[PDB]
Amino acid sequence: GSHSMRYFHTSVSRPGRGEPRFITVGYVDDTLFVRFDSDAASPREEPRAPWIEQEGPEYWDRETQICKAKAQTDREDLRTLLRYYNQSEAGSHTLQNMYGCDVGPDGRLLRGYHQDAYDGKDYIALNEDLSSWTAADTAAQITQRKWEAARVAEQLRAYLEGECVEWLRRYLENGKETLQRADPPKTHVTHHPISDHEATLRCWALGFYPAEITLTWQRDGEDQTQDTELVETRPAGDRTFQKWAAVVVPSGEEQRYTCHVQHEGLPKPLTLRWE
């Protein structure tokens, strides 16, 4: 189906300790493929997926230069935001950047992304037309004026519409074995007796990809959203994900409860009961 490429950037200033910490990751869909940490002795962009390791030296050289370059711009930008907000040098602040593209099955660009956050809140975001900006406050509006004059939106639009989509399609092709293939969740229902009168039912989805999944509990064909403990999707640690949904039921009434599992890897939605 549709695929996405994303680059995530975080710079955090460290008053007294030293210069700001810079960390960035690259994701194709739900697959981490690159990383850069400024905490390294001789920092370089490194491969975290197999299919990205194919790229030659000029690639890793250019990427590492870009990552180092971004870290430095983040220092310049962090200082600027201090003066904008009249904040103190004693305080630590966070700057967060994400840009990416989404493509369809036809390999055509659905939309392009470029967002920035300051201290965990939205700062300035590139609109879906790739020719306008959304600013959070008067400070972001100051930046908006600069970036319009500097044609940053036109810069990004060229990249998003072109080089982003091309290379994404390349990565998609190079790692088509893992990237395109979807792993269905291994599913079972477990039984956990709380008291003599009450038991807990937990529905499991294990080792699936991508992270996108839906787990629901139903009581007599009726939905139990109010009384369902639904944990966040978690990484298993091997590029796969895990998730469970649990309900508490009265002892002897397990047959009333069904677990419904909807994932991409599954040909059809599943319905599970404790057995």
């Binding site: 870009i66 990552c67 500097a150 810069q155 080089e163 982003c164």
Partner: peptide, 6 residues
């Protein structure tokens, strides 16, 4: 491949 601002 990454984008870098001018």
């Amino acid at each position: 491949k990454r984008w870098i601002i001018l």
